[PDB]
C-alpha cells in the first residue's frame, strides 16, 4: 500500500494502434566546447586567398 515499483512494461503487439506502436528514437545534440570543432559536414574545403 503506497509502495510501488517505479517502472512498467510496454504492450507491443502487431495489432496495436500507431499511437501505441514502438518507435525508435535518436536525439542528436550539437555542442560547441572549449575545444576544436571536430564533427564537420561533408562540404569540401577550398584553397585560401
Amino acid at each position, epitope marked *: 500500500f503506497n*509502495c*510501488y*515499483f*517505479p*517502472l*512498467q*512494461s510496454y504492450g507491443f503487439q502487431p495489432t496495436n494502434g500507431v499511437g501505441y506502436q514502438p518507435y525508435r528514437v535518436v536525439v542528436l545534440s550539437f555542442e560547441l566546447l572549449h575545444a576544436p570543432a571536430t564533427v564537420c559536414g561533408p562540404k569540401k574545403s577550398t584553397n585560401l586567398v
Partner: nanobody
Amino acid sequence: VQLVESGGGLMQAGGSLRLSCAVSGRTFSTAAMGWFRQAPGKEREFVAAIRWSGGSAYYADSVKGRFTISRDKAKNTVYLQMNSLKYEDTAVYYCASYQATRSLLSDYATWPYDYWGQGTQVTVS
C-alpha cells in the same frame, strides 16, 4: 525458460512445506515470479507472486498470513512456504514466470504469464 518444481507429496493438515522452483536462462533482473495452482476440475488460481528485484511479495487472500513466498537471487530459486496446510489446499501448484514489469504489484494477480512449470502434487489429509 525452463521451470522445474519439486517438494510435493502427502502431508497432514496443520503441517508446513517448502516448495522449490529453479528458474534458468535469460533471467530478467526486473521481472517477478508467481505461483499458481489448479485443483482437478477447477480453474487455475493465483497463489503468490514475488518480484525478483527487491523481493516484495503479493499473496492471494486464501493464503495471506499463512504462506510465504521467497526467492534467492544468487541461486535463481523461488520458494513457496505452505504453512497450516488444509484439505482445500490440495491441488497441483505451478511455478510461473513473468517477463513484463508492472508498476502496480496487484496486477500480477491477473496478468497472463509467459511460461509455466510442470506442477508438483501436494495432498493434504
